[PDB]
């Protein structure tokens, strides 16, 4: 009975963009895993086709980290607004377990077609 | 009494080596086997037959004048 | 300095594992045998093969470093010999 | 009943014999890998929920082919039905039925899984990891079922021990091709799961000994083409069996089949990088972590270990000749030389020197010193050797004769003996008797001791568990301090000691320390930080008193290794030897009440105190390569400041090049040391202390995860178990908090005092009885599956 991921992982909005300082203000649904050694985001979700750079200021605010993303992963979900066709992205270096838990959370807590 | 047996076995193999019996590989190997058997033994009767067996090796040579050495 | 040059010329960059330098270039072989049985399987007869090469016998000694002839190593005469036997052979060509 | 049997057989038309009375299930006692939000661990439970039916063969013969039917709710039935008809075409998938039957008065859905085996690989893994001499059962059944051995073989004496029965390795090797087939088949399972979009955790509970996968009761589905099978616990728990069973031997043959002859590799091929990547792609295609074929490109120590493991596995494929020093021809003053320029480690790959000088002009003292130390030139000048007295690979002979060394009987003090006998000693029936003597040896002693380095085997360790063990062991050396020192700060005990083969001929270590200046020593030390220097260690026949006729030997290592390990571990170790009150007790005298202070420290706040001691069968000649690399690494950890990463890696390379797998000249002949450790370097005792600590902690972890996890009472210990599993098989990074807590836990409940290979532990009785801390059983199991040796009761 090896269950995939007990407890769900919530989301918070964040910034992304195509290159260098293209992260405009706020464009991405960052699914983040909070560890008390620092908030460590896992996944990015967007309606923007190709985002390879993402941006988040550190806790002190004097620095601001850039993160890289995978090629887009297509899906479509049913919501009140009808069908919405979105792209999910993963930070390079992401192990298979984080992908598994984030997809489990999405496919369980979000309607998909 | 076996302590005396082991001590004299030690001395006998010592004198055998100093007689350069080691130059015959098989002879020295057998003598070493006999010595290692005596020291590890636990019964006195087996020790006697082993020590006389390895002493026959000394007595078969002609480099130790026994009659002078047996001065009583 | 003749054979080793041939092999090192054949390397892609010049590097060859050390363990094959005496396997291909050394002009002498010595074999140590513990008993006649294993001697039959490796060094029977006046010449044998090993390492993709043919070797020819010239000299045999025992633990006492004394000459022993090839006729002397039989099954029945075996218990009369020291048995870390040394046999040296030359690379035949 | 009859209709139930007729329906389970269904269209298959088999001869199902009901090995379970009526329509009742059959509770079996099987091992599982569980991770819920409450309980986690690899432990053996009791399985309900299944009725079994063994198939019958033509002449009423019974074959290991079982039709397992599972009874559960409707939700799981639908969930598995809708995802079974997605991946039905993958050969790795067992055929399902998904029927419904009128059990009693109500309709119940049943899922009939057809043609499995009696045991899944979980049973094999748990049997070969957690072994007991008197509780084999399942291991015997598996081992006899697949025609590996016969039942009368189990009537042999000490059949299960590697040491005095060197045939048991052959028996396990007959089960080997099945595991290769299982991996080669689970790769297509992973690929199909990717193609059809399924996400979940593969466990080695649901895979038969054929390789077919038959359970989808925890799986979820997504868009096809992007599936992420979580092969993390699976491979991690399956690692040791691959090298214990030698499951890659088929690659040694042409076309990957044992019937055909071996592949004849080119002798001059030294770089097998492409083959390493090929095998990694073939068998572990979906292992997330990156792989470096050559350990030079590693990011830090942990990646060094993680790559070295797979290299240890893959090194059993390539011919033994392509491992060792790499020679190149260099001319000096127009004279062509033969000098070592690189090395091919079984575990580290290929390492090339950076400061190789071609077409030099003159050889300073350091250059002559180096070019006279490595075995490259001595090997290239000698004649080929073939020795039938042992099995380990041989190189050459430097001389024209093989010298034979013996031992002397030892002298007798008759005066003291007579004085003792006159004092009522050495008489019959005395509790005091002579049991210590100076034994003698024949002309074959050292060559009869090298076949004890024969007992070492290429070993893989469970990699994630090993990484966590490294992290936890790192704390036991936290109070200490060290780092590099210049040539002026070395302190040498005695200068009148031998140097080695190619130096003893001319002088003693005094001469070499006092001939070359401090600047030259510093230059050599800096040279060793960006090259490799193979050496020759002489093997020597000890002459001392002992209680058993064993020709114990010692190793005189060469002098370059002496300086270039002294300048480093001297400051590392002088801190350890002068510190009191720590688990490592080396350097503290027993006099002036020291022994009492040691014991009082051991009994530090132990709740239910009991004492336990052990002794390893052959500590020095069986230590697997990985654990020695781990010891060197956790000793080199104290250099976070003084050197860069490449310098650390090259220091470790030189250590493993002249202490682990080097050339020993025994009786005027060069032989390659398969592994083990050499007593006679500067860091044998402390490395053995590290190894002892590592074995103790891994035994503790293996014990705590073998527990059921539901009968466990204290909530703190249950949370500890869950988080420990999570940190082992579900975290890619280190967690300082949890390792701190776990170290505190062991130090509170399981206290050790360590000296070289010997240990004394004070432990809590209740925790041991409940399986919360390690006992003699778990420790023996750990030695069995991580040292290839079975410890008996006479050593503990
Ligand atoms: Zn690496
Ligand atoms: Zn340093």
From Swiss-Prot, chain B:
Residues 1-72 form the RdRp Nsp7 cofactor domain. It is found in: Host cytoplasm, Host perinuclear region; Host cytoplasm; Host endoplasmic reticulum. Interacts with nsp8 and nsp12 to form the replication-transcription complex (RTC): nsp12, nsp7, two subunits of nsp8, and up to two subunits of nsp13. Eight copies of nsp7 and eight copies of nsp8 assemble to form a heterohexadecamer dsRNA-encircling ring structure. Plays a role in viral RNA synthesis. Forms a hexadecamer with nsp8 (8 subunits of each) that may participate in viral replication by acting as a primase. Alternatively, may synthesize substantially longer products than oligonucleotide primers. This is Non-structural protein 7. It comes from Severe acute respiratory syndrome coronavirus 2 (2019-nCoV). The chain holds residues 3861 to 3932 of 4405 of the full protein.
From Swiss-Prot, chain C:
Plays a role in viral RNA synthesis. Forms a hexadecamer with nsp7 (8 subunits of each) that may participate in viral replication by acting as a primase. Alternatively, may synthesize substantially longer products than oligonucleotide primers. Interacts with ribosome signal recognition particle RNA (SRP). Together with NSP9, suppress protein integration into the cell membrane, thereby disrupting host immune defenses. This is Non-structural protein 8. Changing residue 19 to S: In strain: Omicron/BA.2.75. It is found in: Host cytoplasm, Host perinuclear region; Host cytoplasm; Host endoplasmic reticulum. Interacts with nsp7, nsp13 and nsp12 to form the replication-transcription complex (RTC): nsp12, nsp7, two subunits of nsp8, and up to two subunits of nsp13. Eight copies of nsp7 and eight copies of nsp8 assemble to form a heterohexadecamer dsRNA-encircling ring structure.
């Amino acid at each position: 009975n090896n269950e995939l991921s007990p407890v769900a992982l919530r989301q918070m909005s964040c910034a992304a963009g195509t290159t260098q300082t293209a992260c405009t203000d706020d464009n991405a649904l960052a699914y983040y895993n909070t560890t008390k050694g620092g908030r460590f985001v896992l996944a990015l979700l967007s309606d923007l086709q190709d985002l390879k750079w993402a941006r988040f200021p550190k806790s002190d605010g004097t620095g601001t980290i850039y993160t890289e993303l995978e090629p887009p992963c297509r899906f479509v979900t049913d919501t009140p607004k009808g069908p919405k066709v979105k792209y999910l992205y993963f930070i390079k270096g992401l192990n298979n377990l984080n992908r598994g838990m984030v997809l489990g959370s999405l496919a369980a807590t979000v309607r998909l077609q | 009494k076996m302590s005396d047996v082991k001590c004299t076995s030690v001395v006998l193999l010592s004198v055998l080596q100093q007689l350069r019996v080691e130059s015959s590989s098989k002879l020295w190997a057998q003598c070493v086997q006999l010595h290692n058997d005596i020291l590890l033994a636990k019964d006195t009767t087996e020790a006697f037959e082993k020590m006389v067996s390895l002493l026959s090796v000394l007595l078969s040579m002609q480099g130790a004048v026994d009659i002078n050495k047996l001065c009583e | 300095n003749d054979a080793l040059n041939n092999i090192i010329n054949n390397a892609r960059d010049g590097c060859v594992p050390l363990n094959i330098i005496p396997l291909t270039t050394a002009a002498k072989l010595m074999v140590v045998i513990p008993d006649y049985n294993t001697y039959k399987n490796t060094c029977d007869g006046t010449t044998f093969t090993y390492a993709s090469a043919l070797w020819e016998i010239q000299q045999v000694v025992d633990a006492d470093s004394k000459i022993v002839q090839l006729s002397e190593i039989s099954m029945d005469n075996s218990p009369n010999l020291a048995w870390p036997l040394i046999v040296t052979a030359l690379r035949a060509n | 009943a009859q209709s139930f049997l007729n329906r389970v057989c269904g269209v298959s038309a088999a001869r199902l014999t009901p090995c379970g009375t009526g329509t009742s299930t059959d509770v079996v006692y099987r091992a599982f890998d569980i991770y819920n939000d409450k309980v986690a661990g690899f432990a053996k439970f009791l399985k309900t929920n299944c009725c079994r039916f063994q198939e019958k063969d033509e002449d009423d013969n019974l074959i290991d082919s079982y039709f397992v039917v599972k009874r559960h709710t409707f939700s799981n039935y639908q969930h598995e039905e809708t995802i079974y008809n997605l991946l039905k075409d993958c050969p790795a998938v067992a055929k399902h039925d998904f029927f419904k039957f009128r059990i009693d008065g109500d309709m119940v859905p049943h899922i009939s899984r057809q043609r499995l085996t009696k045991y899944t690989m979980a049973d094999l893994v748990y049997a070969l990891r957690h072994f007991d001499e008197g509780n084999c059962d399942t291991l015997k059944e598996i081992l006899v079922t697949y025609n590996c051995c016969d039942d009368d073989y189990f009537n042999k004496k000490d059949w299960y021990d590697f040491v005095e029965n060197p045939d048991i390795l052959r028996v396990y090797a007959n089960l080997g091709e099945r595991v290769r087939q299982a991996l080669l088949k689970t790769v297509q399972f992973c690929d199909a799961m990717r193609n059809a979009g399924i996400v979940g955790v593969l466990t080695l509970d649901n895979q038969d000994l054929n390789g077919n996968w038959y359970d989808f009761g925890d799986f979820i589905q997504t868009t096809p083409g992007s599936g992420v099978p979580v092969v993390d616990s699976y491979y991690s728990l399956l690692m040791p069996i691959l090298t214990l069973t030698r499951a890659l031997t088929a690659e040694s043959h042409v076309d990957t089949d044992l019937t055909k002859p071996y592949i004849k590799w080119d002798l001059l091929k030294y770089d097998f990088t492409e083959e390493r990547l090929k095998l990694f792609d073939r068998y572990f295609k979906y292992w997330d972590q990156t792989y470096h074929p050559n350990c030079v490109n590693c990011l830090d120590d942990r990646c060094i270990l993680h790559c070295a493991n797979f290299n240890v596995l893959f090194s059993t494929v390539f011919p033994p000749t392509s491992f060792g020093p790499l020679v190149r021809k260099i001319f000096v003053d127009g004279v062509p030389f033969v000098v070592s320029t690189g090395y091919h480690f079984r575990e580290l790959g290929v390492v090339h020197n950076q400061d190789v000088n071609l077409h030099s002009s003159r050889l300073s003292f350091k250059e002559l010193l180096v070019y006279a130390a490595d075995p490259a030139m001595h090997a290239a000048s000698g004649n080929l050797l073939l020795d039938k007295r042992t099995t380990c690979f041989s190189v050459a002979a430097l001389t024209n004769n093989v010298a034979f060394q013996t031992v002397k009987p030892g002298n007798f003090n008759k005066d003291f003996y007579d004085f003792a006998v006159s004092k009522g000693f050495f008489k019959e029936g005395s509790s005091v008797e002579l049991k210590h003597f100076f034994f003698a040896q024949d002309g074959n002693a050292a060559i009869s001791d090298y076949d004890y380095y024969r007992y070492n085997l290429p070993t893989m360790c469970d990699i994630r568990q090993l990484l966590f063990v490294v992290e936890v062991v790192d704390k036991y050396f936290d109070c200490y301090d060290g780092g590099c020192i210049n040539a002026n700060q070395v302190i040498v005990n005695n200068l009148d000691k031998s140097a080695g083969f190619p130096f003893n001929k001319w002088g003693k270590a005094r001469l070499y320390y006092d001939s070359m200046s401090y600047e030259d020593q510093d230059a050599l030390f800096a040279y060793t930080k960006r090259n490799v220097i193979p050496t020759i260690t002489q093997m020597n026949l000890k002459y001392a008193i002992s209680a058993k006729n064993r020709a114990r030997t010692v190793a005189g290592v060469s002098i370059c290794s002496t300086m270039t390990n002294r300048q480093f571990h001297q400051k590392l170790l002088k801190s350890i030897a002068a510190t009191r009150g720590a688990t490592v007790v080396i350097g503290t005298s027993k006099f002036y009440g020291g022994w009492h202070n040691m014991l009082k420290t051991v009994y530090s706040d132990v709740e239910n105190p009991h004492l336990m001691g052990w002794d390893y069968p052959k500590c020095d000649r069986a230590m697997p390569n990985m654990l020695r690399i781990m010891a060197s690494l956790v000793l080199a950890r104290k250099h976070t400041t003084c050197c860069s990463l490449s310098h650390r890696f090259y220091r470790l390379a030189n250590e493993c090049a002249q202490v682990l797998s080097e050339m020993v000249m025994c009786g005027g002949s060069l032989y390659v040391k398969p592994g083990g450790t050499s007593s006679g370097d500067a860091t044998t005792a402390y490395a053995n202390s590290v190894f002892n600590i590592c074995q103790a902690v891994t035994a503790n972890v293996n014990a705590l995860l073998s527990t059921d996890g539901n009968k466990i009472a204290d909530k703190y210990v249950r949370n500890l178990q869950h988080r420990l599993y999570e940190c082992l098989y579900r975290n890619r990074d280190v967690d300082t908090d949890f390792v701190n807590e776990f170290y505190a836990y062991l130090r509170k409940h399981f206290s050790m005092m360590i000296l070289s290979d010997d240990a004394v532990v004070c432990f809590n009785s209740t925790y041991a009885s409940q399986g919360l801390v390690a006992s003699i059983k778990n420790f023996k199991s750990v030695l069995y599956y991580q040292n290839n040796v079975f410890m008996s009761e006479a050593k503990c």
